[PDB]
Amino acid sequence: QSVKESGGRLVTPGTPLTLTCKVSGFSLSSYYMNWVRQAPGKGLEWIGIMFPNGKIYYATWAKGRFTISKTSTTVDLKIISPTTEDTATYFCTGDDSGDVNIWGPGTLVTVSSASTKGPSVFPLAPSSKSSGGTAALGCLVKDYFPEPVTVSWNSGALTSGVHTFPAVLQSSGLYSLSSVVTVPSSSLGTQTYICNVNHKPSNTKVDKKVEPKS
Amino acid sequence: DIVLTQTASPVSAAVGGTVTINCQSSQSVYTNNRLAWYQQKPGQPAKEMIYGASTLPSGVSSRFKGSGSGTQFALTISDVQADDAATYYCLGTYDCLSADCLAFGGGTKLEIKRTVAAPSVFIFPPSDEQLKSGTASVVCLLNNFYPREAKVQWKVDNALQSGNSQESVTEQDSKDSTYSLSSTLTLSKADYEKHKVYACEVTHQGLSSPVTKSFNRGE
């Protein structure tokens, strides 16, 4: 009934890496297990499968580049010799040949020779040039690597009005993204607005308060 | 080298309407009936909409109908809702002893059509925090517009900027079917301090003339 991938990290070209998928509520010998990846902005590609038997089959393009294996509690995918064409989110799925089809949330593998870099967080301050009970404010999280960055507001109490945009790759080879929220104008002095930024690949975790302007 | 070719994206419909997405397989699937359809909302994983060409899982609406056989299949969504906005992939099964067991189609995005909405526009100067490090990011935000086509023009001291901005657009909102966009112009602290008038000018179908939001540095 549940599946989860882990293991996806930044990794230099050529050094191997194994992702793992831990089942919850069924037995490996009982489902079909597949690995599927999705490069950013592109589509789902199928890597290979493990039958309930224990037979294992690979897509032709994948033959020689991955190992699929199991160990009692989990299903494993090893990327034998990562190139930059291998960076993607990797997905674990479970299928009982009938009514259950199960997907993990996915795990991000980044291949590059670049170095982890934590982000810097700056405020997008509510201004007069930011309507009438419609005040816009936000955070800019700039120059991080690799992905990903999560962003919440007021530790999760603010959900409405929030747009967190996709990250863009800058010229420097580092990502930058913003998150903004619309909010009543009658609120700017009373209520406090704080964006909670977390960039786990560098154990950065800053909470910035976004106050108006002088 | 198995390839499945889907309908070109996007594929559009208004709420209440009807869409067909077609899948053509380069060779017949297993027992001419083993073809499934998956729904992927952005950032989420995929959900099984249809399997075995036409079998509808539990908890998938009967608004989704699979059909076809051999090398030609189709998924048809009726009484479309705004949360149907997603990308739909077909997945073909073949004989593991003579070809790849599975193969995915290129995917087809479904875009929900709604009335034309002009963006609300805001502009943000750089923070003093960021200035104290050598670079200056000016950000302007277009909020809740339809359709996604919008052009942003950056102008400093009235000179059109080219090459020094980047932009991002959200995914279509599953309730209101609109889009949002943020543009970021990046200058050096020196260049930012040299000039005065910072303006973001927006052109969109829902506006006859372009709209301009600007600030004057240090006011």
Residue numbers in the entry:
A (entry chain B): 1 to 130, 132 to 215
B (entry chain A): 0 to 218
Give sentences from the paper:
Importantly, these antibodies do not recognize isopeptide-linked diglycine (ubiquitin) modifications on lysine. We applied a rabbit immune phage strategy to discover four mAbs that selectively recognize peptides bearing an N-terminal diglycine-motif, but not the branched diglycine-remnant generated by trypsin digestion of ubiquitin conjugated lysines (K-ε-GG). Using a combination of biochemical and structural methods, we show that these mAbs predominately recognize the N-terminal diglycine with a relaxed selectivity for the third amino acid, enabling these mAbs to bind to a broad range of peptide sequences.
There are two Fab-GGM complexes in the asymmetric unit, with well-defined electron density for the GGM peptide that binds in a pocket at the interface of the heavy chain (HC) and light chain (LC) CDRs. Close inspection of the Fab-peptide complex reveals a series of hydrogen bonds that facilitate recognition of the diglycine portion of the peptide. The sidechains of HC Asp95 and LC Glu46 make five hydrogen bonds with the backbone of the diglycine, including with the amino terminus and the two amides. The closest contact made with the methionine sidechain is a 3.1 Å hydrogen bond between the sulfur atom and HC Thr93.
